[model samples]
Target: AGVPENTSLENIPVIVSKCREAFNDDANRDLKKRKQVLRSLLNLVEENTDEFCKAIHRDRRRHRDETVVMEILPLRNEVWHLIEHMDEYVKPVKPTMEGAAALDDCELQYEPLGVVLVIGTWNYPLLLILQPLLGALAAGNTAVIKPSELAPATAELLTKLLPKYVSSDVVGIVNGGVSETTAVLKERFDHILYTGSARVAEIVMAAAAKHLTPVTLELGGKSPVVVDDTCADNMKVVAERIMWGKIINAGQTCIAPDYVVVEKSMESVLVDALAEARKAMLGDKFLKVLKGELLVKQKQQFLEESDYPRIVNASHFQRLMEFMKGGKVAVGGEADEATLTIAPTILTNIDPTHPVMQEEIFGPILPVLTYENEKDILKIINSREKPLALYVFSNNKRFIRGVESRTSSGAVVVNDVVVHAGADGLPFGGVGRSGMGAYHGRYSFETFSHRRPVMRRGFLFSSIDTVRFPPYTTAKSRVLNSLLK
Candidate 1:
């Protein structure tokens, strides 16, 4: 069901007054107010850790630590960082007003984007849901959260718990599939944030186009990882991140290392390193844990009663498997449906036109393509659509510099895989196809905001007004064009 629109704005000042208290502000100071709100939200998340994990686990097979490290920790750190550093980022650059109006100066203010809708994706459901919610809260706006129906465990979780932490009237979570979403989408929103697959991203943009609503579509794309051979010394580290990301939640990660490019000389080394890393992380009992035997009795019962899950799904899984055939599956190629765990598989010797190389592999498979020359690898990196993130391992500064300049991704990290996304300081998204906008930590705060420029005119500008009010425009246009140019 759609949220029955509240007439809270009927008393704007009263609403603002209650908001001030919710933000813990007696003095109405901007910095203190924002910080208090952030602190409260973070504390709320921390206090509810067990429930958060349980809710997510019920929604899907998300591991406890995966939820904590990948989703919860990153999101909380972002909010805390924004709270600590907002004073710096939110500062307005005072525009210089010259000419006859030189006495006046303009100030830019970062205002909230008002009544934002935060749409979460099924993968990493809670983090994606609340990341933008905190942004709206930090910026002091009412938030209407649309939790993904694909992960109803999280949706029901929020519908039950949100009212306990924050007021339902000020902040609320709505649960629905298409009907509910279409109803919400029909209503106007100041800003919309949707995160999911690329196909849905297109539908969101089209829906938003009716209102010309500004949106941040956090879509996924075919992200690539490069093992440039020079930093083969830390090849284990690269493999660790790739394997960890791949197996975490059974390769359903959006920023997981999809494909790898390595020097032909180092192909064996990279493959071996990845196998070892997977063994170490998955341990001897991966199948048991994946099948929910490692979960608590209640969750295991729920798992037993439930239908099959593919981490992502069967169609995409089969498609990815087909892509693997396009290359060479060197590592674990086994898929255990009864256990619901696809083995950590690696594919080598891929052609550029192969189906596996075509799209973002949001699955447990990694394709390794060999490159004869750095230029050839660079050409491969630049040829595809920009990825959400790119990792390259090269000790040579010139090679790093050349590749960094030549190729583009949302974020790049040298000598590491997935480290860029792990950092709260760097922005996370795609360049062209991977995504459109980025929002993590303070970037989230900025994402759900508008920089409205304010210019204050004093009595001194009264004289300057005479130049344009009653005047023709030839003289003004001539002077304006010359001075502005």
Candidate 2:
């Protein structure tokens, strides 16, 4: 693909102005049109399912079903969910007041902000853009989407295909890298929703500050997985869930388990179960055949025959390869440069202040640490910034509740890992450095709307309310006090 590295500065304002004009149009505000826009989005995804899958594969070497489950299907559900639940979110609410003021009715109504900019991430390229776009469109705001330049194929495909489905005036796409993004940020927007790292979030927030634009930052952090003794007894199930999360996308997800904290009593059992789970998932035959020189030779063969996901790019591949050092390898630690694939690796005996432990290991690397008590686990987790997700594997309610009460994370999943972020009802976002603001279902609708309060005064109530209009007197004061009660 010969896509440009940056969008033209001259065309940026024109795109923003077009969306601003669309938002002002009464037709764009109609609920029926909103539904149609959503339906058209659904049609765009359904019709181009194969092409979208191919584009993601071209960019990240992601499997077709992975794209369907993670991006396409969830987005489809979001649109359908909005269509079914749209009216309730924007419906006017009557506010009850006491006595004569009750006759002078008050209501709270949800209104859309004019225009929004949705800046997406490379991991789940389409969903990060389209999911927030669903909410903005549902709330009646015109949107301009900027997909991640790191995943150029999906970004380019989106820029080409999106405007044809939804009117370009209602929804526009901008394709580019950092300089292009900086240029786009210069324009004023009613709201901005970004999904990436906190370091980048600071820059996005700083840009929004110039125009007082509200922003939703969905940043990543070192999300941890805690396994207590009780769950380690059922280590087979626990290992399967954790491995599924870590192996998917080669552990590139925002909310993927960044590390594991196990009860010192159960570390050995959990490690054994995890090794067995990896063998089961990756296939024992493939595991037996690929090693050293054989790995490079079989990389292309595995790409066609198996579901092994490669690291997104050369830079990420090099970074993940670096993380392979420091910790003692508990199981797999193989990386093939030719295929850009790292084995689903587990590391143990990792020091608390180790380099691998310090940063978010956004690759197929699982570093396990042990704790004597739950208090120690809480201390370790809270010492750092809050994470996007935290997982605890335990059947004991007291232990689970204890961990829940002690730690702060964007979302907490008990007896499992990494699946809660996809649930439509839950508000998905981070806290502190992980990020701010939340979106998904009703949360998404609220993220793009402003609830305006309206009060209607009746003619009959004016005379009763006029006690404050006269010169200050005991009679007026008494009347005001009586009404206040």
Candidate 3:
């Protein structure tokens, strides 16, 4: 059964309070215990892989194996990575002072913030929550998760299963819609990490500001893919990666290449390559995939076989379909409302001001915009808000360096698209309107922690210490000044 429509928001405060109490408790603060917690989380997925996959499938209609590969395995790897590196993240740093051996020790320590609230996004529901949760746990902070209500089945499943493996008080879930979230936001948290759109991020920031809380907004934007003549020899590889990235979740991914900017000379070549990749992958069954007629197993009959997930809902389906109308279709443009899926599509000769190009086309539609000049491409890209990720497909070091230097994005991947978001030890985040703050691996642990400075001094006073006593003498000032020199 789905979560109750009128789920009481009163429990939100109680949940956060309990998590705080748990953080203050002496349960699992040690690195070994934290590692065990992560191990248990991995076991939760390993033991209940099918069940978790089914929950994600019920919510998104994503294939069971796809969930394991994309969501489950990534989450497992994240926990494993954290467990291996937790010591490095929380280790103290000792500093040496010049001319002052008076202090026995001066160090900076990473301390956990009391309780962190993680507001998850619908896309990649499991990874979004687990990623931050892993960071918070590894940092020894208690976590309260608010999974996206849009993916109700996954949210409900998480609510049911999370407490079984981890301490109930240390980790809690408040499952509901806007009202529940509002109530949860009313309470102060040490840190708040929200992943979603900018419009909602503003609201989250505003709420966090009430308590002067720091927030990590992992948001989405129009991430772009730039292809130049330098990439002609690898156009086939470019098309494969871009198409795979765009079609993985039927284009619902936040870091998926939203559109392509190819040199006018290579626009036709790139478009043809994209179409070739799509045909090779789906054959003539693009319509069947969109219509939900293709079974998960049969989807593998195609080259590069994978089950395409549906749009989150009818509203988004209609919105994506409307975006298709704004562009001149070059490849797959069909949409099936009943299946809530759109065929992996490529649009060419797109008007810059068209609705599809105005904002993020968070669907399978790839708009191909061409530039006659390199300067024009930089000018066009820089004019808009910095994207979450930028793809540069060029062999020219000068061109790639120029693009990276001129444009600001959360992350940049050369000769590839959307894959950097998953790499180990890379900090994933956005700049400007895309979002703020980063979290992944050690970055996540740092995001949920505070670095405190410490200094230890002996009771015996040093001759240099007298200078700080405000004697205001020119001779003493000279001694201090000499030290500065």
Q: Which pairs of residues have clashing backbones in candidate 1?
A: none
Model 2 residue-pair collision total = 0
lDDT string, candidate 2, 1-485, tens digits: 62424668888899998899889885369899999999999998888889999988877778899888888899889989999999888899887788766767799999999999999998988889899999999998999988898888888777778878999999977778887799899999999999998899999999999999999999988999999988745889999999999988889999898999999999999999999999898876566545543444655666445577778778988877777676889899876677787878999988778768888888899999899987789888999889999999998999999999999999999978888978968999999989899999899999999989998875564656567476889988887899689
Which candidate, 1 or 3, has the higher TM-score? 3
lDDT of each: 0.71, 0.87, 0.83
lDDT of 1: 0.71
**Which pairs of residues collide in model 3?**
none
TM-score of each: 0.83, 0.94, 0.92
Worst 10 residues of 3 by lDDT: 297-306
RMSD in angstroms, all models? 6.0, 2.5, 3.6
lDDT of 3 at 52: 76
Which ranges of candidate 2 are over 4 A from the true structure? Answer: 2-6, 96-103, 293-306, 461-467, 474-485
- Cα displacement (Å) at residue 391, model 1: 0.9
Better of 2 and 3 by lDDT: 2
Name the lDDT of candidate 2: 0.87
Give one digit per residue, the lDDT tens place, for model 1 in 1-485.
21222233334334334443443432223667557657777877888889888777766667677678877887777777777777777778776677755666778788765566778898888788888787776766666677787777667766766777667545645556776666666666677888887787788778889887888878776677777768678778777877776777667777778888888888899899998997787664554444444655554444433322245555666676676687777887756444344666888777779877877778877888888877887778788878777777778888788778888887777776655676867766665777787787767777877888887776554655645574667887786677588
Highest lDDT model number? 2
Question: What is the C-alpha lDDT profile of model 3 across 95-115, one tens digit per residue?
Answer: 656656534678889988888
- Off-target runs (Cα >4 Å) in candidate 3 are 2-7, 96-104, 288-306, 460-466, 471-485
